[PDB]
Symmetry: C5
Subunit: 103 residues, 5 copies
Amino acid sequence: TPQNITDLCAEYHNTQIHTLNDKIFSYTESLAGKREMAIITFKNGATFQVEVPGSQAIDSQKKAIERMKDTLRIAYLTEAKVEKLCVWNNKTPHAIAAISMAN
Amino acid sequence: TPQNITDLCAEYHNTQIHTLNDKIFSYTESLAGKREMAIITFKNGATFQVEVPGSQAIDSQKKAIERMKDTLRIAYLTEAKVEKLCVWNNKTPHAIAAISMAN
Amino acid sequence: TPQNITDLCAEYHNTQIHTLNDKIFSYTESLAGKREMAIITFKNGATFQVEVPGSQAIDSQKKAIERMKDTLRIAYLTEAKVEKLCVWNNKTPHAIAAISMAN
Amino acid sequence: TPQNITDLCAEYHNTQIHTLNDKIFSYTESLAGKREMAIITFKNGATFQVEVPGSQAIDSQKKAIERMKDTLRIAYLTEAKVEKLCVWNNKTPHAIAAISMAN
Amino acid sequence: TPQNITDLCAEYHNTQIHTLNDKIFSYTESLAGKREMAIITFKNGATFQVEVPGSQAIDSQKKAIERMKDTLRIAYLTEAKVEKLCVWNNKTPHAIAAISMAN
Ligand SMILES: OC[C@H]1O[C@@H](O)[C@H](O)[C@@H](O)[C@H]1O
Ligand SMILES: OC[C@H]1O[C@@H](O)[C@H](O)[C@@H](O)[C@H]1O
Ligand SMILES: OC[C@H]1O[C@@H](O)[C@H](O)[C@@H](O)[C@H]1O
Ligand SMILES: OC[C@H]1O[C@@H](O)[C@H](O)[C@@H](O)[C@H]1O
């Protein structure tokens, strides 16, 4: 079991870590058919998504995806500093896999 | 995959991108028979709803609707500035499809 | 579709609007068998309940009832001003059908 | 229909009202096997639990149990004054049936 | 029934209490496959996880796992002082079974 976001991120193919150390600049949410998703942006121009849950994803996956959207919304609204994001680069915008917060 | 609310809204028919750059003026919620709606209003007069899901709604759609109503209530309570809304304009009041928050 | 709580409230029999423009004074909740209800009070003496759903209540009603208890709890804790309540006056305490919040 | 916590408490056997008029001193929660419970304490030494649900417990009661733990956590975190607690005194520690919050 | 985290923790083998009396230094969350988990750390170098749910986990166990993650996030964001943690010490990082929060 990884004990940090960098090592967790490295367990997967087509991932990379972004180190932001900054609050979220914008939060976008859609319930539109086939776009049940969330997009956040940082003031440096970086844009990321929380991907739509897939065709019958398992229970743990669907719960974590909803948890991550919960987390980004509350982080944005409270101006909580985001330390790092682990994202999949085979999507556009890059898709969030994990987030770390410190400070 | 759209990277912002304007491009997302343009992927659907019968939608309008609506710019606000303002906090929600009032939040209304109902639990009454087939009116389990949320209504939000803004200072300059605009009025929007989160439409009640019908009897064929799939799980992903129901979950996203529930999420949006959560988002509107917390945005309202925190006086978070709403940048834009993407709304369906063939219903009255217009029905929210997406929301962007910034500033 | 109604565009404000007054007009929504008027679509039902045995309802009425109360205009509080004040924060909630007390919040009560129970998990006791058959009384899974919430009761709120205002400093002017008014008392209102969120009625227990019955054994035939469909899922969309149940979810709205739970949402309203969530809303009342968070308003109470944050001292958010309640503008109006739409209530059924054929129950005691009067039963909440809808709520509006505005500064 | 009870209009307050005291009257509601009186509808059940093996209950009593505690009048704290104080914020929660400590919040404890467990996910351990057979002990999926919450414990709260006050500065005067009183200790109460949110009981583990029974095997037969129906959905509405389970939902209310989960709600009460939500309530105690946020009451604790916001230092919200707890007015009264309705508890079952045939358990140890005494188990929460209802709570009232007021200043 | 245990009346405090220390006694609760002693009911299980391979557990220990950490007395931290300190806020969480960092909060990490992941939705990645096989890694639906949360990791918290303290400024003394202690690192803890909320284990990935088991594929056959019962309902009460799954909900408590979800609740614990909700608690850790809100404790983190509000700088709530964590009093003690009850952890399974046959996991690496040590896995949270119970948390106590006090002032
Ligand atoms: O679990 C979700 C992941 O699924 C992978 O197969 C895909 O490459 C990633 O982009 C991400 O979507
Ligand atoms: O939907 C709940 C409402 O249902 C009505 O039929 C009843 O008259 C009201 O008192 C309220 O209970
Ligand atoms: O509904 C929960 C309550 O159920 C009663 O039967 C029991 O006597 C109480 O101790 C409490 O467990
Ligand atoms: O219930 C969760 C616990 O399950 C036990 O079997 C295990 O030994 C502990 O380390 C922890 O995983």
